[PDB]
Symmetry: C3
Subunit: 310 residues, 3 copies
């Protein structure tokens, strides 16, 4: 049980400052002590300085390529995370990456799939995060990682992203909790036949059935490695208020944590990302502690914590 907690305090994939404070905040809640208490030998991995990156972000509006914002900054930071995560996985350690906005998954997924080529990817999110370079309206890259990982709209992806290995195939990615998919993204999922389970399926079949379906969808070869990239805005805002893109009608706190227990239970989780925790985007301090403690909660449940004896 060797784990490396990758610190990825990046906010360049979106507009709002504060999300780079996620890593520090989670660690204050005692994320490492919790992992250690779950029997994991943990080591912290710092990939870059959040203050320096923030500084460079807030100032250079010139970093743009069309609607896309901060491709250069984003490309540089996610390559750093990729190299870190790839190394963490080669050393045989479990990489637990804490963001940071979801654009960091560009480096995490590439890093993990580079070592575990047949690893499936469960994207827990209210969003599909698969907008293409020329398709994105907002230009916020945290909503475009999967398009770049799948190499969609190749011809329009910047040179600064040339580093991204092409290891993820559409049949190895499954979504859970979708409810704010852009029209362009709907067409993409349908055309690539991506296994996507929206809140409709959860409402229709119950979370247990959805998680089972999602795991099977990316684990056909019998039983392969599984990676989970967890966007906290999947959870209904009334549970996760402090986030950049909240959408009502999401997972309940119970379903959000139950999903983790089911994944833990299958015993094939090889990596985990917990992203989009933005402490600054909270009304009261109640909103902050509820969101950050949720991040640590999914971490604990994903890493084996159960309600009863085990």
């Amino acid at each position: 049980k060797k784990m490396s907690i990758v610190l990825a305090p990046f906010s360049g994939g979106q507009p709002h400052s504060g999300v780079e404070l996620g890593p520090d905040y989670l660690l204050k809640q005692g994320l490492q002590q919790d992992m250690e208490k779950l029997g994991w030998d943990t080591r912290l991995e710092r990939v870059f300085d959040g203050k320096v990156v923030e500084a460079r972000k807030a100032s250079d509006n010139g970093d743009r390529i069309g609607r896309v914002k901060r491709p250069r900054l984003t490309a540089e930071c996610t390559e750093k995370i990729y190299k870190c995560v790839r190394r963490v996985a080669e050393q045989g350690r479990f990489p637990l990456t804490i963001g940071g906005d979801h654009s960091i998954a560009l480096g995490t997924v590439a890093g993990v799939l580079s070592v575990h080529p047949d690893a499936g990817v469960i994207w827990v999110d209210a969003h599909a995060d698969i907008n293409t370079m020329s398709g994105t309206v907002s230009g916020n890259l945290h909503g475009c990682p999967l398009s770049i990982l799948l190499g969609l709209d190749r011809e329009n992806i910047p040179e600064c992203f040339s580093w991204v290995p092409q290891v993820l195939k559409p049949n190895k990615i499954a979504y859970i909790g979708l409810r704010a998919v852009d029209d362009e993204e709907k067409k993409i999922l349908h055309d690539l036949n991506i296994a996507a389970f929206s809140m409709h399926h959860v409402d229709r079949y119950g979370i247990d059935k959805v998680v089972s379906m999602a795991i099977e969808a990316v684990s056909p070869k019998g039983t392969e490695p599984v990676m989970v990239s967890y966007d906290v805005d999947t959870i209904d805002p009334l549970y996760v208020p402090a986030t950049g893109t909240p959408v009502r009608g999401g997972l309940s706190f119970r379903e959000a944590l139950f999903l983790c227990e089911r994944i833990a239970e299958c015993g094939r989780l090889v990596a985990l990302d917990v992203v989009e925790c933005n402490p600054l985007l909270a009304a009261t301090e109640s909103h902050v502690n509820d969101t950050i403690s949720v991040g640590c909660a999914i971490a604990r449940c994903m890493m084996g914590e159960t309600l009863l004896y085990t």
Copy 2:
């Protein structure tokens, strides 16, 4: 795809002013643009002036027949809606009626069943709305439409209601979400063997199963037209605060919208009422926007809007 959005700004079926503001408020949210965006050719149908009706309502306390309040006013306005809706349906257009209190369903159901005689009726409500003329304690007619439509307690129904056609039979009406049924109403449902699915059934079988059961109950002849009269107080107040008769322990925002998607999915919806939205009965502006946007949301989901590609 021809639709007529029937505006029924009536509040005479209950005490609290404000519910007549529903139609306007929904339209401000962009109800028509949403329907148009769903591919519907929409036309607005104004049945009467809400200010004039309100004025006449707030002043004439003399309009009563026992406990029943405003039978004359109610009878005149609902006959107007009936004529409008009956015409809308004869023209082959889908009538989407926005209230207004639930007493308007006296005109909508009569209008629709007049054209689609074998149409089933799904009453989504926390209440049975079937109190008889001599049985009602409050005398508020928005809780008596189904008794008049089924012609119960004939001998005690006013002359001003002589216009109501007898087209709805007990075996063609199904309730979903019941939780505040009056004792008299419990006896009625049991005696007439009305298919009623309370929050107990939803809690017991899950919303998907209940909707399936409700649709089948009124669609025995194989597959007949279906009409839905949707009272927003079916949804738990913590989701729909701005309503006249809130009862805790109701449908979640997710179940409230999932039910719409399932009905849409069956492809036999022929009419829809969205009632009891009272903007004035809101604490903050957060309560208002949450309720009105919910009304538009059920409209969109009922009319085909899905989370994924379709």
Copy 3:
């Protein structure tokens, strides 16, 4: 239909004052009138004066045996409840005990099992309440009743508890709603193979299935008497705020009441405890009325109240 509403205004099993106000508060809500309205012939049973007991509690910090706090006071009061409940059951009346903290279940369960020796026990709680004398960290006895009832850690249980009959066996107790079990308690449940259904099972199988499983687990001999000891902190705090030990991710108001209807429905309920309602631990008066009215609600549903005709 003969019922005795046992008043047990005790708070010695925990630190916070106010929980002894539960009985009075529930009765103000009209608990007795509700039971009478459900057809029960009710009689109130006062076991001791809450003001006198409170007075004696708040002053004597000397009443301790290790970490355990107020064993003498607790032992004296619960023996009183035991004698009352045992008598109520011998008279052939249904004992409905209103607390008071959960330490009162020491007297209720012993009283009921003394008359109905093969009675099963459903413990609805977020906690296992089975910490041993030498195992409890907090020393609060409201979290140790089941250890004393099962006679665990005999050698370390005070003399003042010598009165407790040994009538409850591990295979006749089932938990529902667990989510804050101490490590020592996890080991105990696992070693004694106690049927425990946590929020994981509710999330996994749905409340209906859990209640069915829980009833069967203690009713093997075909169909024996069933007793329910209901801790209101089983319900998610956002529904039951005014309680001493709230834990997020609990039962919804709907599941909390549905469980009661299912138990009522089986027709074998022989006793009921509604505990841990602490009116003083409420932010607004909204928190108070929501919690106390919940207590009366579970009472009504447990005693036969249904949403539809019955």
